[PDB]
Amino acid sequence: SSVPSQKTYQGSYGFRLGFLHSGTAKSVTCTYSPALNKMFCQLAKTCPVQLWVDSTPPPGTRVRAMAIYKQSQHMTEVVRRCPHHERCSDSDGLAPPQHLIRVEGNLRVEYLDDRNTFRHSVVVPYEPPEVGSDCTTIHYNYMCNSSCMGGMNRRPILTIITLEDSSGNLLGRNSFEVRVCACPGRDRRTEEEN
Amino acid sequence: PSQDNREIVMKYISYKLSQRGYEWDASEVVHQTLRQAGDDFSLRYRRDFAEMSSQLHLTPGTAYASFATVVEELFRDGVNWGRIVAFFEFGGVMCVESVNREMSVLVDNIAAWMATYLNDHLHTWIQDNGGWDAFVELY
Ligand SMILES: [Zn+2]
């Protein structure tokens, strides 16, 4: 009956999200707009999300991703994939077919179907940035366009990224809007106009 | 039935090692989808397989329990086809790594270890989830 929280929480470790400086040139697979806090991508393409931190969390920390609908009319509905893409055989062997968000290139990935909320989420172990770099980068995949009727059906969503400890207590939260579409460039410069 | 799964190990390792120069050994379409799925996983998870290797110091004296510890971490959250493919691919990576270090004898050991872990922990799950022909139906 309740809704996950979108409220930002930099917490004790100074948790903040980052994105690549990709432009809106045509045929761009995934691009982020700072002014709208909205990422634009196309199905199954890698969307890099980097995690920026002021104080490195202890080992055993986890990074969870979860989608919610943005409009208050639909926030109580679970964000799941269309029927066409659930039965679509696009599974990598690690992700259950109903989940909308996936993580690629991480064998330690796990998918949760919450037995009380019935909301999907995907979580990886937190690891500090690679030696020489400054931030932890995660590659997400969205497995269904927002335009998909029978699933999202034109309803904008947000992705919530949270840091939690071994037992799942909140250490940090951040959020950003997401549109999965065919032309993320033209559709970005469009939404930026209005 | 256990002998049928020993074959899947040896066929997977023999073809992986035959993709390199080394020749070795001590329906076919079930092995076809496994081998290609495994070729996919070594690109997607090269850094994970590299980590799993460094934590398993592969020496002539390496016991089976050391190998079963690394593989048991792979199935900690449950067994699925993706993690099963990583298991076959990781074993194959170890066999390829051993002959590249002039330690070809270690291949016969890794094959035994994979066969034992397969029958002792993975096979009961495989039968209850539609068998191997459920794996060809998804991949
Ligand atoms: Zn869909």
Residue numbers in the entry:
A (entry chain A): 95 to 288
B (entry chain B): 7 to 32, 90 to 202
What is the paper's account of this structure, in its own sentences?
The tumor suppressor protein p53 triggers transcription-independent apoptosis through direct interactions with BCL-2 family proteins, but the molecular mechanism is not well understood. However, anti-apoptotic BCL-2 proteins antagonize the activity of pro-apoptotic proteins by canonically binding to and sequestering the BH3 domain of pro-apoptotic proteins through a large hydrophobic pocket (called the BH3-binding pocket). In this study, we present three crystal structures of p53-DBD in complex with the anti-apoptotic protein BCL-2 at resolutions of 2.3–2.7 Å. The structures show that two loops of p53-DBD penetrate directly into the BH3-binding pocket of BCL-2.
To improve the success of crystallization and to ensure that the linker does not affect protein interactions, we linked this BCL-2#3 construct to p53-DBD via three different glycine-rich linkers. In particular, crystals of the three BCL-2#3-linker-p53-DBD fusion proteins were successfully optimized for X-ray diffraction, and determined at resolutions of 2.3–2.7 Å in the P 21 21 21 space group. The RMSDs for superposition of these three structures are 0.2–0.5 Å. p53-DBD and BCL-2#3 had similar interaction modes in these three structures, indicating that the linkers did not affect the complex structure. Two loops of p53, the loop linking strands S5 and S6 (S5-S6 loop) and the large loop L2, insert into the BH3-binding pocket of BCL-2#3 which is composed of BH1-3 domains. Around the hydrophobic core, Arg107 and Tyr108 of BCL-2 form water-mediated hydrogen bond or direct hydrogen bond contacts with p53 residue Asp186. Asp111, Asn143 and Arg146 of BCL-2 form direct hydrogen bonds with the backbone atoms of residues Leu201, Gly187 and Val203 of p53, respectively.
